[PDB]
Symmetry: D2
Subunit: 494 residues, 4 copies
């Protein structure tokens, strides 16, 4: 039961957020944000750059000073604030979901039932961690009392992507705020709206000025300014592998700020011959096509055992052909447009590459509508490991199905990648499930399911899919600076 | 690769161990310890009673005084001491294994390869815990600095059974010593020898006097004296459910000392129709017949799915018939005698009960030799839940095989018990394994295996099979007294 | 800032709470609950006995069945429910505070600003734990996958005292519910009202029927029925050392249910010569007189160094004399009446004992009013260790001041007790503070403060002050049943 | 009790260690390692470069393959191997200490009693962690079973400095091996000898070929090769801030390997007016002069309160003048030479800068001997925050004494630095100690002591002194790659 959306949500926030106030870019420049469903401009947004980031960092540093309201605040109260923010987001759930769809393109039903639900669960999960991430009292040698204080890392720069606007903001703000840090966030230029509105809710919830600062703008400008800043203590980035390298290089070239990266992937979804056919087919479809295929851990490499290959392919093709593409605001729409023209073109280019390299086009392969950035659900059969569409992150509704014979074979082929964000295994066998989940080199291995995220469970990549983990208890590690205090005592006893 | 045993090991220790010295009982009384393989007396052992326990408790209390060598000793050094004890036990491995067999009756090969190996692995594991069981620094509300000190619980009374003499001693000493406690141990009257010799090694290792005290003697005397003592802070008991109740009542009646119990069981071993027949058969055999069937978590209720029942039974009977019973010192012996005459007769009474109640005797059922306490491997088929041999812990080589149809059925029947120490599931199906492991009400659930103990994994019972857990990190909880220190500070900051 | 109270709050709940419904006792019997400020009957309350407890246990067991709404509920949702209950309690904060004062006697201002605040903080803290009390994946030896499930302990019997009605209920419900257990609570016969109203809010919050059941009644009847019940998995008791013993004996005599106890104390408050005089005097007053002296960890033994003894006593006596005693609803009242006539008389008997044993009566010592159960703030000087008022828990506004010379002397004198609930040290010296906090044998050691409780910090006693800990992460241990699952895998790898 | 040293220990190892075998550099080139005490060449050492690192990485990768001896080895056995290595290092303690002194220059007595003792304590500590760094079982939403596997991070490149050759090797090998990783270590060109010999002991201990590989050589060559390698999963570096940046940039430019850094410092040692004069003076001396002043956390900024400044300075100057400089093998020597000519000159240059900037030279200031790299213990008084010697890491026996008035003042001045490795506070006041320890922006804050390291307590820097922590449990974080396994189950229950 999803509330009727407002297909034309009003925009109340489109500037730079510093000290709980709205500012125009120092340059006074603005950039347009487009609605992918029509190709039309929604509104202008302040174009933050280096000078704006500088104002944001100073505000955050000021809010982080010893003795400030944010630093003195009870840990439990930080939890109270996070829950309040969640309550406020829930109050405006219908509006935010609509605005999310307008600027991103994903179906409103999904924005409401999935994106916003996950945002609420993430913030509420971390609210609980606020006063529970204990330090330790250590039984060190000699006559000493030794313990550790889990302090905030400090001024945290957070650069996020456009595929899950609200959710990426939550995954970042949740752990940072729970541990008492201050934030300078750089939202994606393609989807700045929903994040900016949430800043209004952050102010309404009671967060002190400067605790959360959002600077909308481009990457090489605002993004690089944050990564290279001399007064930013830590940076958390989610995006392409290419930019992740630039982020880490910026960190090492500047003040050696701490770094955590959540990059792309080319996750393998392995279907064994003993899998439940109907379930595997539907899950494999979801694994790749979810969120217009714009998911970091998308099952972009569907390995299917030769005994069930033919049947699996027929069913997969049928499902892809029945996948409804249209206006995201229509409750019947399963797939909306791609985020922008750049992604639109990049995906079409990959489809063309797939055709040239010898992959078998089974369905789709072209534009789905003359207005917007809609692409037909595309499925390639008989894909070989050496093919481009088998090695590069397409980030669109383009499925690759590969055939394999043995379990040893598939392990080597699945792990033969520079990526290692996620992986999946579909089987009814206990030993095969354990054998594969142990052998697969990925941050997350789903068994008989896919895209199962939980605020409780860690998520991150192996190899070049990133470093560090987000969500769960692990998501607090990167936002904590450990201090050891060793005190001389008259006589130590157990 | 088992060294030739000394079939008549010399006894060097047979008195009360207090303050790293050997004492006769105050009463000067002694009791005989018998060799179950011949029924002959090995030697006399000091019969400790209340007055002897009192001397041991005072010695322990003195060793636990603030400022004592044991209290001031670095946590890491306690670890060094435990590793030293392990090394000494390894030096005398061949001797201890032989002595273990002589007094307990289990096969020498098993004493050497299993019991002693596990003892070594238990002590070495806990040695590593000595300086790693951290306390916490807590982000409490207000201007305070709050933290916890994990202190030793104090004088720990440890009462152990006779089925695994050396191992039960290790499971008790390892965690207690790693956390800096002092001990007053009451070993079983049937097998006091090996534990007493280890006391010599404890002294040789460098442990301060009074840290470990051992009082051989009977239960209602020495055992009850420890459980009811006004100066014993904690008691850990391993034995029958009947005595466990007595221990807990004694604790409540005395000084409210902390209690942890490891009692009996009637563990169900579930064999699904899709299990590997050969494997399940051999494992089910081991699950019940191990250590003359004198194992707390023995799979005494073998549930077999109707479609594979007949074949499973035929193979089970054949294996039981081929099981070699004889002199424990003979390399070909799989099963030695029962611990003593009391157990010998108790088991025969159960076999008679099984015949009278209608269970089908498939093999064995009687005495295996005219000398010693040897009983033929016995297997009962078509056992029903209401039968005595299906509800009561037999503790002998008596196997119960029950038939079942559905998975929902077996769950209910397996959980329909006052016991809940362990359980096992044999299947190749992922979902069946996960379904059963979650549903079964047991402290340990083995999947496609049985009797897999690891110093790293906890062991304990649900319901009336005990309370608390031993082994792993959990094994330190009961030996730790938590102290909170909350300090007023000028101004708290995150 | 305190809202004007309704000095005559209406009672809406006075029956037995089972399956979210109100029931009369099977016997139809009722008992009167008195207002200690007037000695008049507030109303009648259903007198629950064994048969009523049986209905409660069965309902709880039913709500705990595998596949039930409570068992299947997401852990995070349990957190949501706990936060909802907290919100409902805050909505009715003014009403609950008034009702607390009416039935207990403590000052309304304190009920509102302290009791209810602490209740809200306790529930909100534990709501955050609901989905974060992780189990473990263990690197066990051999080819196995070993892990632990942290399951609910089951049907939890919770028996609470009358000194902090709402708070004791919160301390019990918070951790139990956070971990997925079901509850059968027995509230104190002297103060059943507030807890019963909270049951209504529990139903309003959405908790499934049978998750929380409250049975008002007496101890030897309803209380003993819970402790001795064959289907109660765990019992948590807070009360006298005398009844604690009875509970533990009942547990051992019945089904060996797990037990945690929170008993009395005779907590020492040590004031060193270098302490801040004004601060120590005020805190020492609060340490003992708080909540009409009806506090488990009351600083009933005030040790003062000889060089500051005379001045400390003069100031303490003056503070005691200025302490306003009267109607709890009057904002100027610091101290209300004692809970009932039984306590009233017991305290008067102790004051007489103090006079007879040679303690110097400095002020007070008699009845403060003709109506109600008011006792004058009483101070005894030159108290000796052997005196009864120095060894037994008075639980009234009776202060004992003892003189001491050295720091070594006070450690021995403070530790020479069967109690060990709490302790405190007042000093400006780093070494003295560390020396004492380590040496003191108490569950909580406050430094330069007293009665500082935090939902984040554990609380419990050493020796006969109880066993186990409440609050903090440690508060979840007793409500968790650990299950180890060890699965055989094809080939284990690190 | 120090055994007489062999002042001319024979060198047995001076090549590249790959696959438990000794190899010459592919280029066949060698470099000389000098004895700083005489300026003479000890021996030639294989000069490893990129090609040799490539051989090392491939061997490490091979040893890390799924199914290899190192991967299948029980975690507990990895602990057994670490303890064995520790025992072997202890067997050869006298020899290793002598060789440490010969190549590094530090006093033999210190090498024996401190360096080697700490090495032994580090390895034995981590040996215990091998099978205790548990993963988690998470109570995720929905019908799923979610858990994490704590897997080894992989091929770990470890680059270490020359100030503590053996110890730096222990701090790196202990955690890496405890968690099942493989290593390619690059020891300092100035002190390669001792580490190479330890490789012989690693082979003798039973560690599989390729698990530990050591490549002696220069930084821009061998070091850079490791940091930029496409198949190295993680790099741990200990050295200058300058090279730390190069390492992080190389990591971002190559394969985005994980990075942890342990850089330099300019640690403030604060002496309050109420400190114990004698103690503070002796500890301030040790704080700076330890290990010829070649300590990362050296107290290079001694802040002394004005009221005790003159007395503190007089005593400090007297202690520095009495400090015995000479042959490190002579028992009376407190200070040996600097590690090499480059450091020698760098330190002399800093002393010159101190004289030019206006700092008051109180003692020393020049060369202590005509042979070797000996520098007189130098003390500068009246140092100002803006002076070069007050901002840059000198790494020599040059002490800076600065005067201050208030506690608020010293906090600001102590924190006004790009470094933040450690700090110290000397005071008898509880409040001041807690105020300062909380306020100071440093990885380790010592109270009434200094240079107190424990294998149990974390060590690392804030700001530019590094990132991540070493030692303690935290030391395992960087050598662990978290994997989440989420399995669909029929029906999830608590
Ligand atoms: N430890 C504490 O925090 C605490 C709390 C309250 C009172 N006390 C001590 O207890 C003394 C007496 O007061 P009290 O009568 O209210 O304590 P109590 O132990 O008798 O009552 C506490 C709770 O236990 C229940 N209870 C009583 N008998 C029981 C039994 N036989 N089986 C099961 N439950 C039973 C009572 O009904 C009540 O719910 C006080 O003067 C004080 O010394 C201690
Ligand atoms: Mg880009
Ligand atoms: Mg018995
Ligand atoms: Mg009573
Ligand atoms: Mg260099
Ligand atoms: Na857009
Ligand atoms: Na015997
Ligand atoms: Na009352
Ligand atoms: Na050298």
């Amino acid at each position: 039961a999803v509330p009727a959306p407002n297909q034309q949500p009003e925009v109340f926030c489109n500037q730079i957020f510093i000290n709980n106030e709205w500012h125009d870019a120092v340059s006074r420049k603005t950039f347009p944000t487009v609605n992918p469903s029509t190709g039309e401009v929604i509104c202008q947004v302040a174009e933050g750059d280096k000078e704006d980031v500088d104002k944001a960092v100073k505000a955050a540093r000021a809010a982080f000073q010893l003795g400030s309201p944010w630093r003195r605040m009870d840990a439990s109260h930080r939890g109270r604030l996070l829950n309040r923010l969640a309550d406020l987001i829930e109050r405006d759930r219908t509006y935010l979901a609509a605005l999310e769809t307008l600027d991103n393109g994903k179906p409103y039903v999904i924005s409401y039932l999935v994106d916003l639900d996950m945002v609420l669960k993430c913030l509420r999960y971390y609210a609980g961690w606020a006063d529970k991430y204990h330090g330790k009292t250590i039984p060190i040698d000699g006559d000493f009392f030794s313990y550790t204080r889990h302090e905030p890392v400090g001024v945290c720069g957070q650069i996020i992507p456009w595929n899950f606007p609200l959710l990426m903001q939550a995954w970042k703000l949740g752990p940072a705020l729970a541990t008492g840090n201050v934030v300078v966030m750089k939202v994606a230029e393609q989807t700045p709206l929903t994040a900016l509105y949430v800043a209004n809710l952050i102010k309404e919830a009671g967060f002190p000025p400067g605790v959360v600062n959002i600077v909308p703008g481009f990457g090489p400008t605002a993004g690089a300014a944050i990564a290279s800043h001399e007064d930013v203590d830590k940076v958390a980035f989610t995006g392409s592998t290419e930019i992740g390298r630039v982020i880490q290089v910026a960190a090492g070239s500047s003040n050696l700020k701490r770094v955590t990266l959540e990059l792309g992937g080319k996750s393998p979804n392995i279907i064994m011959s003993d899998a439940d056919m109907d379930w595997a087919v539907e899950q494999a479809h979801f694994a790749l096509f979810f969120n217009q295929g714009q998911c970091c851990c998308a099952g972009s490499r569907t390995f299917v055992q030769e005994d069930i290959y033919d049947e699996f392919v027929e069913r997969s093709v049928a499902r892809a052909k029945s996948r409804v593409v249209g206006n995201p605001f229509d409750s019947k729409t399963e797939q909306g447009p791609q985020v922008d023209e750049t992604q639109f073109k990049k995906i079409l280019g990959y489809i063309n590459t797939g055709k040239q390299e010898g992959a078998k086009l089974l369905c789709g392969g072209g534009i789905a509508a003359d207005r917007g950035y809609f692409i037909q659900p595309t499925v390639f059969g008989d894909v070989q490991d050496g093919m481009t569409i088998a090695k590069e992150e397409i980030f669109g509704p383009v499925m690759q199905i590969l055939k394999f014979k043995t379990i040893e074979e598939v392990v080597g082929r699945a792990n033969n990648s520079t990526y290692g964000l996620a992986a999946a295994v579909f089987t009814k066998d206990l030993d095969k499930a354990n054998y594969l989940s142990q052998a697969l080199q990925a941050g997350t291995v789903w068994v008989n399911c896919y895209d199962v995220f939980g605020a409780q469970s860690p998520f991150g990549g192996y190899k070049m899919s990133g470093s560090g983990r987000e969500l769960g208890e692990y998501g607090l590690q990167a936002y904590t600076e450990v201090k050891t205090v060793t005190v001389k005592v008259p006589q130590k006893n157990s």
